[PDB]
Design a protein around this motif. Structure first.
Motif, PDB file in Angstrom:
ATOM      1  N   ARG A  72     -27.678 -53.827  18.688  1.00 60.98           N
ATOM      2  CA  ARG A  72     -27.176 -53.206  17.465  1.00 60.98           C
ATOM      3  C   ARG A  72     -25.654 -53.147  17.487  1.00 60.98           C
ATOM      4  O   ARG A  72     -25.054 -52.549  18.385  1.00 60.98           O
ATOM      5  N   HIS A 111     -34.154 -45.718  24.758  1.00 58.93           N
ATOM      6  CA  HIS A 111     -34.375 -45.431  23.348  1.00 58.93           C
ATOM      7  C   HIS A 111     -33.828 -46.518  22.429  1.00 58.93           C
ATOM      8  O   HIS A 111     -34.528 -46.967  21.514  1.00 58.93           O
ATOM      9  N   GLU A 112     -32.592 -46.958  22.661  1.00 56.31           N
ATOM     10  CA  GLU A 112     -31.904 -47.901  21.780  1.00 56.31           C
ATOM     11  C   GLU A 112     -30.794 -48.558  22.576  1.00 56.31           C
ATOM     12  O   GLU A 112     -30.343 -48.014  23.582  1.00 56.31           O
TER      13      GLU A 112
END
Ligand SMILES: Oc1cc(O)cc(/C=C/c2ccc(O)cc2O)c1
Length: 271
Positions: free
Chosen positions: A4, A79-80
């Motif tokens: 991301r 988590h991310e």
């Protein structure tokens, strides 16, 4: 694999720093959309192909790929992942109780922690994941104020999948905790973790490090020679079965060392 690339600060607020290393810093954080709290590990990227500073993208991707596989109560979860030009940012489960290191134990207290470590490593080794960096610094607690805290293995920065029984790579772990095959630059497999557990168990019971010398080269030389002993001043009231468990892990030949399944069936551990 790409991560991301939105600004992490648009989705999380950071707070207290939880840990700092050579190429990474870990900061407590809070997700804006849910109010849920995490630990953000900022890993510095290499800025050129041949540079020695920062972590290579190959190494970062291996760590992320391993973290994405694991879901177990005794292992940290991911988590991310975000990234920008300078860092990859792992949003990891918040483990707030501090290190097992910062936290001499009785055999019941030692085994209560050790059983959780063994359960976590059994999960990893079942998935053919070698951690390669097991040490008290990488064993954290969820709540350090309860009589028997619940632990989580962290730091998969050296972890590797072992799909051929062994891997031939150099592992620059911490001298006090690395197995002889690491010291000697030999092929490595799940057995190296079992040696590290033996070192951890020795420290848990005695407060003393079995191979620690005055310099790093002394420690490494002691590891390779299996130069340790149980000091009576530290082990006088420790059971012979606890010493037996350690002795069957601190074995130079990896093929003769106890496996994770062996360690769970050993009479000191088996209920
Ligand atoms: O909640 C906390 C607190 C803390 O002090 C450290 C961590 C995680 C460290 C860590 C985990 C996985 C990994 O691959 C690398 C890491 O450095 C999580």
């Amino acid at each position: 694999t790409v991560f991301r690339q939105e600004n992490v600060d648009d989705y999380y607020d950071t707070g207290e720093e939880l840990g700092s290393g050579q190429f990474a810093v870990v900061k407590k954080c809070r997700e804006k959309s849910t109010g849920l709290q995490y630990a953000a590990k900022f890993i510095k990227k290499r800025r050129t192909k041949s540079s020695r500073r920062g972590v290579s993208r190959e190494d970062i991707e291996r760590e992320v790929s391993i973290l994405k596989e694991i879901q177990h109560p005794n292992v940290i979860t991911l988590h991310e992942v975000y990234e920008n030009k300078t860092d990859v940012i792992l949003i990891l489960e918040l483990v707030a109780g501090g290190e097992l290191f910062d936290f001499s134990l009785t055999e019941e207290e030692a085994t209560e922690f050790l059983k959780q470590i063994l359960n976590g490593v059994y999960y990893l080794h079942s998935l053919q994941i070698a951690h390669f960096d097991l040490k008290p610094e990488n064993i954290m607690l969820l709540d350090r104020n309860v009589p028997k805290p619940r632990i989580k293995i962290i730091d998969f920065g050296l972890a590797h999948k072992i799909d051929f029984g062994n891997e031939f790579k150099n592992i620059f772990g911490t001298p006090e905790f690395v197995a002889p095959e690491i010291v000697n630059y030999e092929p490595l497999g799940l057995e190296a973790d079992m040696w590290s557990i033996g070192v951890i168990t020795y420290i848990l019971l005695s407060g003393a490090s079995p191979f620690l010398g005055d310099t790093k080269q002394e420690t490494l030389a002691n590891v390779s020679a299996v130069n340790y002993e149980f000091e009576d001043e530290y082990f006088s009231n420790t059971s012979a079965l606890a010493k037996d468990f350690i002795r069957r892990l601190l074995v130079k030949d990896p093929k003769k060392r106890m496996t994770i399944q062996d360690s769970l069936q050993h009479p000191w551990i088996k209920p």
